[PDB]
Amino acid sequence: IVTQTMKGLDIQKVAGTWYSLAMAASDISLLDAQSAPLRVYVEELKPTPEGDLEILLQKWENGECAQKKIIAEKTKIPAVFKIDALNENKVLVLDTDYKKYLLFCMENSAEPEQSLACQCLVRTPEVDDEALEKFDKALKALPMHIRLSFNPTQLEEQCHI
Amino acid sequence: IVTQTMKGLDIQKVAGTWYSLAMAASDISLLDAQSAPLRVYVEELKPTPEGDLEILLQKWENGECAQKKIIAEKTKIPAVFKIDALNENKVLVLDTDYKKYLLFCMENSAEPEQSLACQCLVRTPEVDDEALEKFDKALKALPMHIRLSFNPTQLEEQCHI
Ligand SMILES: CCCCCCCCCCCCCCCC(=O)O
Numbered sequence: 535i536v537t538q539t540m541k542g543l544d545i546q547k548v549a550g551t552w553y554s555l556a557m558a559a560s561d562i563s564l565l566d567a568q569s570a571p572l573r574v575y576v577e578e579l580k581p582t583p584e585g586d587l588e589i590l591l592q593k594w595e596n597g598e599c600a601q602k603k604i605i606a607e608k609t610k611i612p613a614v615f616k617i618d619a620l621n622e623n624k625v626l627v628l629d630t631d632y633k634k635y636l637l638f639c640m641e642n643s644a645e646p647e648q649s650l651a652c653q654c655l656v657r658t659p660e661v662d663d664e665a666l667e668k669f670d671k672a673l674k675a676l677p678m679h680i681r682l683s684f685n686p687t688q689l690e691e692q693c694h695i
Numbered sequence: 696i697v698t699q700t701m702k703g704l705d706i707q708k709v710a711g712t713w714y715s716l717a718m719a720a721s722d723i724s725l726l727d728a729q730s731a732p733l734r735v736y737v738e739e740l741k742p743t744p745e746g747d748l749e750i751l752l753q754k755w756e757n758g759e760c761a762q763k764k765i766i767a768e769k770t771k772i773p774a775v776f777k778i779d780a781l782n783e784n785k786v787l788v789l790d791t792d793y794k795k796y797l798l799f800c801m802e803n804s805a806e807p808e809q810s811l812a813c814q815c816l817v818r819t820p821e822v823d824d825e826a827l828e829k830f831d832k833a834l835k836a837l838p839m840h841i842r843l844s845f846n847p848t849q850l851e852e853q854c855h856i
């Protein structure tokens with residue numbers, strides 16, 4: 535369902551620390567609680583020389599902020615990865631400037647809108663109006679029903695408080 | 696903190712059934728859970744001939760969808776009401792066409808952004824892109840951190856499911 539992707543993406547250049555400035559989902563139950571399914575906070579991206587991609591994130595599990603390491607296997611499209619969970623979930627890089635932000639979405643295979651979540655990643659704990667601009671514009675199309683945003687304070691905290 | 700209001704508002708003409716198409720809050724904890732503080736669904740508005748305003752809403756309380764009747768006492772400004780809870784909370788009518796939608800916000804007295812929530816009300820269980828347009832434009836300024844939207848199905852349901 536995600537319609538735009540970043541052309542000529544250089545996945546090595548996205549390596550580094552990132553902040554989940556904002557997130558949006560097609561379903562409220564995707565982001566509603568602290569424990570919700572795709573309510574995940576990004577730490578840093580770590581691509582492998584084979585073009586793969588390892589991800590370090592926090593995920594509130596069992597009334598507690600847990601760290602996590604996911605792996606996204608690159609595919610034939612530079613901007614689309616597939617993580618190693620059950621039901622081949624696709625992670626799509628929409629856009630990025632490598633040093634200011636990253637807009638990615640992640641959807642179910644064969645089931646978009648029921649499972650579809652997008653994030654605005656920034657390199658600093660500062661809210662980026664330009665970035666949020668592009669993010670809201672990108673999802674303007676998409677059928678999003680929930681939408682969060684975090685403050686600098688919450689971004690320096692584990693699990694955004 | 697809410698900066699725009701509806702001029703020459705005719706509070707009698709807002710009488711009737713309404714749907715909470717969308718909501719936004721300055722704080723995630725205002726709308727996060729089913730039980731959150733300003734996560735309230737509107738049924739119908741009922742103004743009194745003295746220009747007062749009685750409100751019927753649903754509010755998930757104790758893991759259960761409860762109905763509720765609030766009263767908003769009119770003030771010297773036609774578009775601003777004050778409901779009878781502790782700490783004089785102000786309800787502000789931003790805009791409306793009486794027969795398509797209503798954009799209102801409700802804030803704390805002397806404490807905006809910590810407590811500030813806004814809704815897009817529509818007369819039908821249809822999502823209204825024009826309406827959501829105006830709503831997102833109105834809050835574009837405001838410091839909102841959470842934002843929900845509901846589908847026709849959820850709007851015919853008590854507590855939006
Ligand atoms: C290419 C840009 C990288 C963007 C980061 C992608 C984040 C993937 C997160 C997938 C959700 C999985 C988290 C839930 C963990 C669990 O299984 O409990």
Ligand SMILES: CCCCCCCCCCCCCCCC(=O)O
Nearest residue numbers: 733735740750754763786788799801
């Ligand atoms: C003038 C337009 C009318 C808009 C409707 C205003 C809705 C007011 C809701 C105030 C929040 C109070 C709900 C919580 C109830 C409780 O005390 O448990």
